Amino acid sequence: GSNQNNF
Ligand SMILES: [Zn+2]
């Protein structure tokens, strides 16, 4: 699946 990191 797809991954997003929003710091
Ligand atoms: Zn994946």
What's the distance, CA 6 to chain centroid? 7
Resolution in A: 1.4
* 6 Cα–ligand 1 center, Å: 17
DSSP 1-7: -------
Residue that is written with structure tokens 């997003």 in the block: 4
CA atoms within 13 A on the CB side of 7: 0
> Token pair for residue 6?
């929003």
What method was applied to determine this entry? electron diffraction
* 2 Cα–ligand 1 center, Å: 5
The CA distance from 3 to 1, in Å, is 7
* 7 Cα–ligand 1 center, Å: 20
> Token pair for residue 3?
């991954």
* 4 Cα–ligand 1 center, Å: 11
What's the distance, CA 5 to chain centroid? 4
b/e map of 1-7 (b: 16 or more CB within 10 Å)?
A: eeeeeee
